[PDB]
């Protein structure tokens, strides 16, 4: 029950975009294609399965950002002593993933490089 | 402080040559009476950095910070909204270390079962 040219897999729509984004723009990319659109999220080891083969083979494309992404700022940081984070010297720049086609793992990447990415919406 | 560590401004301080993973090196700091080092201060970061630099570029450096979030990497959500709860992150760095590539300027996340030589503080 997708739109044309959509891949179907349990309930859900997906669609690999050959067009290299930044992370930031893909995820735009997608919100404003269709009515809950968004970066592809990955919920299952058979859905990765599926999009693995669908990019690698059908697109022959090995690296697309999915929605994962997140700054330091956001995550629970704690010194070993107890002591309170005040002083930083981390990157206040974002994280961004991208899944790779061959086993499917996720690896960190800089979110301002360009990539192919994948849209995915519930039907 | 033991005549083998640096004082300074009411702590004792010391970088460990002896390579070990994040874990065991704040167990080494605490058999020590101390901890993988804390910094709370420009200046303070300067001191360490000064150290780590006459006493070691090859290596990062165990600091004593880390993620402690239960997931593999950081995000409890992903942009659609959904829940992490399915992971595949391929080498998950959630250990603190000082930045080699900077001359220990600057922190970086590293995996945590990696082996580098670290800094008590006490």
Same mark, same amino acid.
């Given at each position: 029950? *997708?739109?044309? !040219? ?10 690999? %975009? &050959? /067009?290299? &984004? @930044?992370?930031?723009?893909?995820? =735009? %990319?997608?919100?404003?294609? /269709? ?22 083979? &059908? ?16 995550? #629970? ?18 994280? *961004? +993933? ?12 800089? *979110? ?10 519930? /039907? | ?14 970088? %460990?040559? =002896? ?5 065991? $090196? ?13 910094? !709370? ?5 300067? +001191? /360490?950095?000064?150290? $780590? ?38 080498? #998950?760095?959630? *250990? %603190? ?8 300027? @600057?922190? @970086? !996340? ?6 580098? #030589?670290?800094?008590? =503080?006490?």
């Amino acid at each position: 029950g *997708c739109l044309p !040219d959509w891949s179907s897999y349990k309930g859900h729509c997906y669609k690999v %975009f &050959k /067009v290299e &984004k @930044t992370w930031a723009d893909a995820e =735009k %990319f997608c919100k404003e294609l /269709v009515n809950g659109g968004h970066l592809m999220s990955v919920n299952s080891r058979e859905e990765g399965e599926f999009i693995s083969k669908l990019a690698l083979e &059908k697109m022959r494309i090995v690296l697309v950002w999915i929605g994962l992404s997140h700054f330091w700022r956001i995550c #629970p940081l704690r010194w070993t002593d107890g002591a309170r984070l005040d002083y930083r010297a981390l990157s206040d720049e974002p994280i *961004c +993933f991208v899944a790779e086609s061959f086993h499917n793992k996720w690896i960190q990447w800089t *979110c301002n490089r360009k990539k192919s990415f994948v849209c995915k919406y519930r /039907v | 402080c033991l005549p083998d560590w640096s004082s300074y401004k009411g702590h004792c301080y010391k970088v %460990f040559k =002896k390579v070990g993973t994040w874990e065991d $090196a704040e167990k080494f700091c605490v058999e020590n009476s101390g901890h993988l080092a804390s910094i !709370d201060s420009k200046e303070e970061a300067d +001191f /360490v950095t000064k150290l $780590a630099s006459q006493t070691l570029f090859v290596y990062d450096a165990w600091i004593g910070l880390r993620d402690e979030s239960k997931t593999q990497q950081c995000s409890p959500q992903w942009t659609d909204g959904s829940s992490v709860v399915y992971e595949n992150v391929d080498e #998950p760095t959630k *250990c %603190f270390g000082l930045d080699v590539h900077t001359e220990y300027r @600057t922190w @970086t !996340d590293l995996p945590c079962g990696e082996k580098n #030589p670290f800094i008590c =503080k006490s």
